[PDB]
Design an enzyme around this catalytic site. Structure first.
Site, PDB file in Angstrom:
ATOM      1  N   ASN B  76     -35.800  19.200 -76.158  1.00  0.00           N
ATOM      2  CA  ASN B  76     -37.061  19.320 -75.443  1.00  0.00           C
ATOM      3  C   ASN B  76     -37.333  18.140 -74.520  1.00  0.00           C
ATOM      4  O   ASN B  76     -38.408  18.080 -73.913  1.00  0.00           O
ATOM      5  CB  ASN B  76     -38.214  19.468 -76.442  1.00  0.00           C
ATOM      6  N   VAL B  83     -40.329  15.261 -70.549  1.00  0.00           N
ATOM      7  CA  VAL B  83     -40.647  15.957 -71.790  1.00  0.00           C
ATOM      8  C   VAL B  83     -41.409  17.229 -71.442  1.00  0.00           C
ATOM      9  O   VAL B  83     -42.272  17.223 -70.557  1.00  0.00           O
ATOM     10  CB  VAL B  83     -41.453  15.063 -72.750  1.00  0.00           C
ATOM     11  N   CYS B  84     -41.070  18.325 -72.119  1.00  0.00           N
ATOM     12  CA  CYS B  84     -41.727  19.609 -71.897  1.00  0.00           C
ATOM     13  C   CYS B  84     -42.850  19.772 -72.913  1.00  0.00           C
ATOM     14  O   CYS B  84     -42.601  20.073 -74.085  1.00  0.00           O
ATOM     15  CB  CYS B  84     -40.728  20.757 -72.000  1.00  0.00           C
ATOM     16  N   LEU B  85     -44.085  19.578 -72.460  1.00  0.00           N
ATOM     17  CA  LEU B  85     -45.266  19.763 -73.295  1.00  0.00           C
ATOM     18  C   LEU B  85     -46.296  20.516 -72.465  1.00  0.00           C
ATOM     19  O   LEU B  85     -46.769  19.983 -71.440  1.00  0.00           O
ATOM     20  CB  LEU B  85     -45.818  18.421 -73.781  1.00  0.00           C
TER      21      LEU B  85
END
Ligand SMILES: [Zn+2]
Ligand SMILES: [Zn+2]
Ligand SMILES: [Zn+2]
Ligand SMILES: [Zn+2]
Ligand SMILES: [Zn+2]
Ligand SMILES: [Zn+2]
Ligand SMILES: [Zn+2]
EC number: 2.3.2.23
Lengths: 86, 143, 428, 75, 574, 75
Positions: B76, B83-85
Site C-alpha cells: 500500500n 501512501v494510498c489512504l
C-alpha cells in the site's frame, strides 16, 4: 324506360403486377422508366424481369448488373430468368 | 484565513493527551506548517518510523500531504513516499478529520495489507505470507 | 366559373418531395436562454408547491424533462425528492451546540444547517464555498459533514460569498451547468459566441449559427456528418504534429469524452468532471507475431484505398471557390459578348452547388462503408457510390471542360445526380 | 498578441498574451476565465509540453496560434 | 513662351509643330486652366450644362492634341478626364439619383457617355435603376390589386406592360449595355416573385397556367384569334415564365390542365401542344415533368391505335351496346395517376359487362400488366325521354349512377338515404353530384327538383325529396346540353365501413325479397324469378347478377329453398 | 330523437321515442302502427344486426332510417 345509353368513353390505368414496387438498385418506382432511358429519351421500351425467387427489377438495371455479379441484389441465389416483361 | 488557529488548537490537543502506536508529531522550530511525525507498530514491531507532514493553506478544507522518509516494504506504499489512504486523498476527506486520526489510520494501514501501488508486492503477498514475513521482517534495520 | 377551386384538385393530394435532412432550430442569445430556463421552472414550482431553488435543483438532475418529473412525482413523491439529493435518506446516522469544524461553542443566532440538520457555524461554510467556487464548481457544493449527499440551494449560497466577483463567477458556472444539463439546449462551438441553440427533439442533424456561421452535429459538436454514426466518425478521425502526442499519451473519458492524461502512480483513475471511475489499463468499469506485416498489408491497403477518396473530396472543398469564380467569369464573358442576357446563364451555379453537395456526401459515405459489414448491403452501397462518381465526373466534364451548353441535357443530368445522391443517403 | 485555446469541451475562446510571458500567468488567466485549477492543466503546442519555467516565445508563441488544454489526473 | 500661344487659343500656326522638334509643362498648363475655369462655369450654369461643357471640351482637346502635340494623347485625355469628371462625379451621380424619373433620357445618355470613361463610375447607375424598377413595379401592382388577383389575363398583361416599358426605357436611355440589362433582369426577378398583392402566397404559377389553358382550350378567346397570334402570346408567356423560382407548381397545374384537355379532346391544335412541350423543355423546366408529358402524348397515340384495333377485332360480333359507340383508353399509371385507391359506385349493366372484354383483349397481347379503372375520368352521352321531348346530354359516371335510379320508378320521389343505398356512394360525393345535377350555372330549367329548398349543398337532411322534372325544356324539342364542367381528377379517401354496411343491407334485403316471393308463390322458374325480384325491389335498389346468384347458393346451403331435377333453372320451395 | 322505420315495399313507419328507451319496447311499439309479431321483427342500422344496447349505444340520434327486416324461416 327513360335514360337510355348512347355513347360511352372509358379510361383505365395500367401498371405492372409485383409485390415489390421498387427496383432496389435505383430510386425509381417500377411503374416509371429507368434513369438511363430518361437520359436517352427512350420511347418507353424497357420492361421488368422476374427471377426464380420472385424478384422484380428493370431489364436495363439487371442487364447492367449481370455482367459483374451473377446473383440477386437482395439474396445470393443463382439468377436465371423466369418471365420477361414484354 | 483561520488555519493557524486550527493548527495551534490541534497542537495543544496532541500535547495534552498521548498515544502509544503514534509516538509524537513535531513542528520543526516554529515552521507552523511543516510537521514531523513518528509511529511504531506491533511484522514491524521494532522501529521508529519517520513521516513528513505538509499542511496546505485553508487546511481543514484541503487535504494535507503525507510521505514517509524511512523506506518500508508495503503493498500500500510506493517506493519513495506515496501512501494510498482515501482519507488523505481528496476523494474521501472531510473537514472534521484531524491529523491524529490520519496518523492512526496510517498506523492501522501499516498493521495489515490491503490487496495497490506495487504489483510485485501484491502478487508476493497474495500467494503466501512467508515472503511478507521474511523480506518485510528484514526491512526496517536496513533500508 | 371554370377556374374556381382549382388548387384543391391537383396531384392526387401528393406532390413536391420531402427533404431527408431537415431539423428545426431557433438560435437564442444569452438573455433569451436565461429567460427560457427561468420559464421552464415556475410551472414545476407552481405544480409541486415548492420553492424555486429546490425546483431548479431537482430539474437539473432529470435533464429538464417535465413530464417524466410529474409522472415520477405521482408515482413516489418521496423518492422523487430523495433521488434529486434534496432530502436526507432514511438510512443515515447521527454533542449539542458545538461547531465540529472550527471547534468552539457558538451562539444560537448562527450555526446554519440544511435539511440534514448538521450544524456548522456561519464563520464556516464561507471558506468552503469560496474554495469550491474558485476551483470552478457550480452544482457540486454539498454538506461538509461526512456521507451527506445533500446539495446546497443557491439562495443558501449567495448570502455567504463575501464579494461580487465570486458571485459573478458562481452565476457564470451555474449558467454553464444549466445549459449543459438541458436537453433541447446546446452551446455554439467556435470563437466567443454567446449564442445557444434551442431545438424540439434531441437528435443528430445539421445545425447553424446566426452570428458566426458554424456547422456541427448536435451531439458531437465537431463537424456535420450525415451517414456516419457520430461515434464512428470520431473513431475514423482518431485513427487516420500534436496528433501523435495526443494519440500516444492521452485517452478519452468513457461517459463524457474528455482528453485526459495520467500524472503518475496508481491505476485507479477517477474523472474529475463526471465522477466516472475507470481503469487506465484497457478502460472499463470496476465490476470486473510471425508475418505480422503480411497480415497488416491488407489493412493498410484498405485504409489508404479509402483515404485517397477522403482526401480528394476534402481538397474539393478547398478548391471550391476557384470553381465558383471560373463559372462567374465564363458567365460574365458570355453576357459581355451579347450571347444572351443574365437570366439565361444561372443554371451553371446550381450545377456547381449540386456537385459540391454530392462531393461532400460522397466523402462522408466512405467511413460508413468501411465500418459497415461483409454482406450484400456492402456489395451494393459502394456500387451506388461508383454510379454517383461516374455521374459527377460526367457533369464536371460537361460544365467545366466544355464550351457548348444545352440546357435540357444539363437539367436532366442534374435530376439524375440528385436522385443518385438521395439513393445513397436513403438509409439515413 | 492574441492566442486561442482549444478547450476539452471544444469551445475555442480567445485570451490576451504578452510577447514573452511565463506559463504561470497564462494558466492563471485560464483558471480565472474557464475554471480548471492551474495544477490540473497540460498545455501542448506543436507536440511539446510547456514547462512552467520556459517562456512562451521559446516555444514559438506568436500571433494567431492555436493551443490545446488537457486535464491533469493522478491515480 | 510656347505655352503662351496655346493659351490664347482657348480664350480666342505651324510654329508649334517645329517647337516640339517636353510635355509636362503642357499638361500642367491644361490642368491649371481647367482647375481655374471649371468650378466657376459649373456654379454659373448648373450640372445639366456642365455635362455638355465637359463633352465639348473633351472632343476639342482631343482634336487640339492631335493637331499640335502627338501615346501622349492618352495621358492628356486621362488627366483631362481626371480634371473634369473624376472630381465632380459625386455631384453628377447625385443628379442621376435625383433624375432617373420623369423620362429624361436625352440628358441621361450624355451622362452615361461622360461617366463610362472613369472606372467605377457606373455602379450607382445600376443601384438607382434597380431601386426605380422595384419601387415602380410594386406600386403599380398594388395600385390595382382588386381587379388583378381574380383575372389571369389582366395579370399577364400588367406584367408584360411593365417589362416592355422598362426594356424600352433601358434601350432609349442606357443604349443597351449588358451590365444594365443584368440590372433590369435582377430588378424584374425581384418584382415578379412577391406576395404583397396576395395575403390580403405562391399563386402566380396558378394564374399563368390558367392563362395558358385559356389560350390552348376551345374558349371564345381562342376562337377570336388565329394560330400566329396564339404562338406570339405563348412566347410572351414563356418569356415572363422564364423569370420565376417556383416552376414545379406551374408544371403540376399545367399537367392537370393537359389532363382535362387531351382526355376530353377539347383542344384547339395538337401541334401547338407539342411545340409548347419543346419550348418548356428549352426554357429549362424540371426534366421529370417534361418527360412525363412526352409520355402522355405517346400514350394517347398508342391508345388511339389500340382502340382502332379493338374496334376492328370486335366489330364482327354485336353486343348489347354497338361496337361503334364505345371508346377505350389505356394509360400509364406513373405519368397520369399514381393512386390505386378503390372507388365504390354502382354501375349500369351495359358497361359492367364491358370490363372483362377489355381486360381479355389487353391480356391477349401484353403479358404482365394490371388495369385500374378510373371512374372520375369517364364520360358519355345519355338520352332523356320526357313527356315534352327527347333529349341527349353529357354526364359523368356518378351522375349516370344517380340518374338511373328513376328508370323503374319514373313518377316517384327518392330520399337521401335511398340515394346513398341505390347509388352506393359516400355522403360528400353524393352531395357534390346532387348539387351538380340540381344547381348548374345558368340552366333556366333544371333536371331534378327538391321540395325542402336550401341555399347550400351541405345543408341537406336525410328526408329531402328528389323528383325528375317532367317539364324540362332546352321551348325546343330536341337538343344537347353539357353538364360536365372541369371534371374532377381527385377525390377524398373512402372508408370501407359504409360500403360493408351497404353490402350487408343489400344481401339481407335480397334474401327477404327472394324468400317472400317464394312463400307467396310456391314454385317459380329462373327468368321470371329475376323479373319478379326486379319488380318487387323498385323502391330499394336494382339487384345484380352475382349477388342474387350468391344468395340462391346461400339459401340452398341453409335449406330455405331446394333445387329440382327437371332442369337447371327451376327451384322448389323446401 | 325522432326515428323512422322502413319496410321492404317502402312504407315509412313513423314513431316518436324518448332518448332513453328499450330495444324490445321500441320494437313492440311498431306493432300498433302495423300488426306484426314481436319475434318476426328485426332492426338493422349501419351494417350489423341490432341486439336487445338499450337506447343510444348504437348512436341512433336525430332522423335515422332503420330497415325493418322480417324473420326468414318462420315469417
Ligand atoms: Zn432500376
Ligand atoms: Zn430502361
Ligand atoms: Zn433473389
Ligand atoms: Zn448533512
Ligand atoms: Zn465553525
Ligand atoms: Zn456561433
Ligand atoms: Zn456526431
Amino acid at each position: 324506360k327513360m335514360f337510355s345509353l348512347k355513347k360511352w368513353n372509358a379510361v383505365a390505368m395500367w401498371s405492372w403486377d409485383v409485390e415489390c414496387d421498387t427496383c432496389a438498385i435505383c430510386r425509381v418506382q417500377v411503374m416509371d422508366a429507368c434513369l438511363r432511358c430518361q437520359a436517352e429519351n427512350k420511347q418507353e421500351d424497357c420492361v421488368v424481369v422476374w427471377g426464380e425467387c420472385n424478384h422484380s427489377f428493370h431489364n436495363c438495371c439487371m442487364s447492367l448488373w449481370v455482367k459483374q455479379n451473377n446473383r440477386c441484389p437482395l439474396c445470393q441465389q443463382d439468377w436465371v430468368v423466369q418471365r420477361i416483361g414484354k | 484565513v483561520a488555519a493557524s488557529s486550527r493548527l495551534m488548537k490541534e497542537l495543544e490537543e496532541i500535547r495534552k493527551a498521548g498515544m502509544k502506536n503514534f509516538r509524537n508529531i513535531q513542528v520543526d522550530e516554529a515552521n507552523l506548517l511543516t510537521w514531523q511525525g513518528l509511529i511504531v507498530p506491533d511484522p514491524y514491531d521494532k522501529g521508529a518510523f519517520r513521516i513528513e507532514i505538509n499542511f496546505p493553506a485553508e487546511y481543514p478544507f484541503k487535504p494535507p500531504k503525507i510521505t514517509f522518509k524511512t523506506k518500508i516494504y508495503h503493498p500500500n506504499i510506493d517506493e519513495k513516499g506515496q501512501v494510498c489512504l482515501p482519507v488523505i486523498s481528496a476523494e474521501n476527506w472531510k473537514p472534521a478529520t484531524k491529523t491524529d486520526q490520519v496518523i492512526q489510520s496510517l498506523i492501522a494501514l501499516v498493521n495489515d495489507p490491503q490487496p495497490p501501488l506495487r504489483a510485485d508486492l501484491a502478487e508476493e503477498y497474495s500467494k503466501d505470507r512467508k515472503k511478507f514475513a521474511k523480506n518485510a521482517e528484514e526491512f526496517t534495520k536496513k533500508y | 366559373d371554370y377556374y374556381v377551386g382549382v388548387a384543391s384538385d391537383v396531384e392526387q393530394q401528393g406532390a413536391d418531395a420531402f427533404d431527408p435532412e431537415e431539423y428545426q432550430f431557433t438560435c437564442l442569445t444569452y438573455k433569451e436562454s436565461e429567460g427560457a430556463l427561468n420559464e421552464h421552472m415556475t410551472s414545476l414550482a407552481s405544480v409541486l408547491k415548492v420553492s424555486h431553488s429546490v425546483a431548479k435543483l431537482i430539474l437539473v438532475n432529470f435533464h429538464w424533462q417535465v413530464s417524466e418529473i410529474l409522472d415520477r412525482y405521482k408515482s413516489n413523491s418521496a423518492q422523487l425528492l430523495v433521488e434529486a439529493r434534496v432530502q436526507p435518506n432514511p438510512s443515515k446516522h447521527v454533542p449539542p451546540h458545538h461547531c465540529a469544524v472550527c471547534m468552539q461553542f457558538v451562539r444560537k443566532e448562527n450555526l446554519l444547517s440544511l435539511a440534514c440538520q448538521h450544524q456548522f457555524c456561519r464563520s464556516c461554510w464561507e471558506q468552503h464555498c469560496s474554495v469550491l467556487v474558485k476551483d470552478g464548481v457550480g452544482v457540486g457544493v454539498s454538506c461538509m459533514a461526512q456521507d451527506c449527499p445533500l446539495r446546497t440551494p443557491e439562495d443558501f449560497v449567495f448570502p455567504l460569498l463575501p464579494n461580487e466577483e465570486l458571485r459573478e463567477k458562481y452565476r457564470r458556472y451555474l449558467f454553464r451547468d444549466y445549459v449543459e444539463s438541458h436537453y433541447q439546449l446546446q452551446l455554439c462551438p467556435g470563437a466567443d459566441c454567446p449564442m445557444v441553440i434551442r431545438v424540439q427533439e434531441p437528435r443528430a442533424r445539421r445545425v447553424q449559427c446566426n452570428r458566426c456561421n458554424e456547422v456541427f452535429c448536435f451531439k458531437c459538436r465537431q463537424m456535420y456528418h450525415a451517414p456516419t454514426d457520430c461515434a464512428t466518425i470520431r473513431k475514423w478521425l482518431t485513427k487516420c504534429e500534436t496528433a501523435n502526442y495526443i494519440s500516444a499519451h492521452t485517452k478519452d473519458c468513457p461517459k463524457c469524452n474528455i482528453c485526459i492524461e495520467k500524472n503518475g502512480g496508481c491505476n485507479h483513475m477517477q474523472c474529475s468532471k463526471c465522477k466516472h471511475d475507470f481503469c487506465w489499463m484497457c478502460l472499463g468499469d470496476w465490476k470486473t507475431n510471425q508475418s505480422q506485416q503480411a497480415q497488416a498489408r491488407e489493412a493498410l491497403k484498405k485504409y489508404l484505398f479509402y483515404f485517397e477518396r477522403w482526401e480528394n473530396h476534402n481538397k474539393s472543398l478547398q478548391l471550391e471557390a476557384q470553381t465558383y469564380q471560373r463559372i462567374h467569369e465564363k458567365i460574365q464573358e458570355r453576357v459581355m459578348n451579347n450571347l444572351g442576357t443574365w437570366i439565361d446563364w444561372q443554371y451553371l451555379q446550381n450545377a456547381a452547388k449540386l456537385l459540391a453537395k454530392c462531393r461532400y456526401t460522397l466523402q462522408y459515405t466512405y467511413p460508413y462503408a468501411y465500418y459497415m459489414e461483409s454482406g450484400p448491403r456492402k456489395k451494393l452501397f459502394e456500387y451506388q457510390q461508383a454510379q454517383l462518381e461516374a455521374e459527377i465526373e460526367n457533369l464536371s466534364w460537361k460544365v467545366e471542360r466544355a464550351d457548348s451548353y444545352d440546357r435540357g441535357d444539363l437539367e436532366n443530368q442534374m435530376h439524375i445526380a440528385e436522385q443518385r445522391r438521395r439513393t445513397l443517403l436513403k438509409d439515413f | 498578441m492574441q492566442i486561442f485555446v482549444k478547450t476539452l469541451t471544444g469551445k475555442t475562446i480567445t485570451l490576451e498574451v504578452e510577447p514573452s510571458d511565463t506559463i504561470e500567468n497564462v494558466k492563471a488567466k485560464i483558471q480565472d476565465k474557464e475554471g480548471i485549477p492551474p495544477d490540473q492543466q497540460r498545455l501542448i503546442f506543436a507536440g511539446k509540453q510547456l514547462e512552467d519555467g520556459r517562456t512562451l516565445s521559446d516555444y514559438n508563441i506568436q500571433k494567431e496560434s492555436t493551443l490545446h488544454l488537457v486535464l491533469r489526473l493522478r491515480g | 513662351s510656347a505655352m503662351k500661344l496655346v493659351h490664347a487659343e482657348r480664350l480666342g500656326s505651324q510654329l508649334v509643330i517645329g517647337v516640339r522638334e517636353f510635355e509636362k509643362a503642357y499638361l500642367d498648363s491644361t490642368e491649371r486652366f481647367y482647375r481655374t475655369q471649371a468650378p466657376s462655369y459649373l456654379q454659373q450654369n448648373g450640372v445639366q450644362n456642365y455635362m455638355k461643357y465637359a463633352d465639348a471640351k473633351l472632343k476639342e482637346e482631343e482634336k487640339r492634341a492631335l493637331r499640335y502635340l502627338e501615346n501622349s494623347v492618352e495621358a492628356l485625355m486621362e488627366c483631362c478626364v481626371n480634371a473634369l469628371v473624376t472630381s465632380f462625379k459625386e455631384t453628377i451621380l447625385a443628379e442621376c439619383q435625383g433624375m432617373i424619373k420623369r423620362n429624361e433620357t436625352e440628358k441621361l445618355h450624355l451622362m452615361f457617355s461622360l461617366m463610362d470613361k472613369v472606372p467605377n463610375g457606373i455602379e450607382p447607375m445600376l443601384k438607382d435603376l434597380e431601386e426605380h424598377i422595384i419601387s415602380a413595379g410594386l406600386a403599380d401592382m398594388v395600385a390595382a390589386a382588386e381587379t388583378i388577383t381574380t383575372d389571369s389575363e389582366k395579370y399577364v398583361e400588367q406584367l408584360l406592360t411593365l417589362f416592355n416599358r422598362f426594356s424600352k426605357l433601358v434601350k432609349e436611355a442606357f443604349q443597351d449595355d449588358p451590365r444594365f440589362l443584368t440590372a433590369r433582369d435582377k430588378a424584374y426577378k425581384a418584382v415578379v416573385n412577391d406576395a404583397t398583392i396576395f395575403k390580403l402566397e405562391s399563386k402566380c404559377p396558378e394564374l399563368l397556367a390558367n392563362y395558358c389553358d385559356m389560350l390552348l382550350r376551345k374558349t371564345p378567346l381562342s376562337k377570336k384569334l388565329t394560330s400566329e397570334e396564339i404562338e406570339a402570346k405563348l412566347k410572351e408567356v414563356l418569356l415572363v415564365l422564364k423569370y420565376v423560382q417556383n416552376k414545379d407548381v406551374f408544371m403540376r397545374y399545367h399537367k392537370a390542365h393537359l389532363t382535362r384537355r387531351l382526355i376530353l379532346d377539347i383542344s384547339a391544335d395538337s401541334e401547338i401542344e407539342e411545340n409548347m412541350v419543346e419550348w418548356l423543355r428549352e426554357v429549362g423546366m424540371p426534366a421529370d415533368y417534361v418527360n412525363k408529358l412526352a409520355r402522355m402524348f405517346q400514350d394517347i397515340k398508342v391508345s388511339e391505335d389500340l382502340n382502332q384495333a379493338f374496334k376492328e377485332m370486335h366489330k364482327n360480333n354485336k353486343l348489347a351496346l354497338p361496337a361503334d359507340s364505345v371508346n377505350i383508353k389505356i394509360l400509364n399509371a406513373g405519368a397520369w395517376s399514381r393512386s390505386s385507391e378503390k372507388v365504390f359506385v354502382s354501375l349500369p349493366t351495359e358497361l359492367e359487362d364491358l370490363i372483362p372484354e377489355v381486360e381479355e383483349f389487353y391480356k391477349k397481347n401484353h403479358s404482365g400488366r394490371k388495369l385500374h379503372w378510373h371512374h372520375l375520368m369517364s364520360n358519355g352521352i345519355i338520352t332523356f325521354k320526357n313527356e315534352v321531348g327527347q333529349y341527349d346530354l353529357e354526364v359523368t359516371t356518378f351522375q349516370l349512377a344517380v340518374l338511373f335510379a328513376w328508370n323503374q320508378r319514373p313518377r316517384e320521389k327518392i330520399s337521401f338515404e335511398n340515394l346513398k343505398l341505390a347509388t352506393e356512394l359516400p355522403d360528400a360525393e353524393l352531395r357534390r353530384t346532387l348539387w351538380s345535377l340540381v344547381a348548374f350555372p345558368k340552366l333556366k330549367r333544371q333536371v331534378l327538383l327538391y321540395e325542402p329548398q336550401v341555399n347550400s349543398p351541405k345543408d341537406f337532411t336525410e328526408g329531402t325529396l328528389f323528383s325528375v322534372n317532367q317539364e324540362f325544356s332546352l321551348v325546343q324539342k330536341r337538343g344537347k346540353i353539357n353538364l360536365i364542367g372541369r371534371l374532377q381528377l381527385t377525390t377524398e379517401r373512402m372508408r370501407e365501413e359504409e360500403n360493408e354496411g351497404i353490402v350487408q343491407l343489400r344481401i339481407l334485403r335480397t334474401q327477404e325479397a327472394i324468400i317472400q316471393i317464394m312463400k307467396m308463390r310456391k314454385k317459380i322458374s329462373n327468368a321470371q324469378l329475376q323479373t319478379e325480384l326486379v319488380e318487387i325491389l323498385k323502391n330499394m335498389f336494382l339487384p345484380q347478377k352475382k349477388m342474387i346468384k350468391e344468395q340462391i347458393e346461400w339459401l340452398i346451403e341453409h335449406k330455405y329453398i331446394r333445387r329440382d331435377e327437371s332442369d337447371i333453372n327451376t327451384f322448389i320451395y323446401m | 330523437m325522432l326515428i323512422k322505420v322502413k319496410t321492404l315495399t317502402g312504407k315509412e313507419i313513423e314513431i316518436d321515442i324518448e332518448p332513453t328507451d328499450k330495444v324490445e319496447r321500441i320494437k313492440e311499439r311498431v306493432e300498433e302502427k302495423e300488426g306484426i309479431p314481436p319475434q318476426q321483427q328485426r332492426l338493422i342500422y349501419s351494417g350489423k344486426q341490432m341486439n336487445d344496447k338499450t337506447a343510444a349505444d348504437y348512436k341512433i340520434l336525430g332522423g335515422s332510417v332503420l330497415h325493418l327486416v322480417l324473420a326468414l324461416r318462420g315469417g
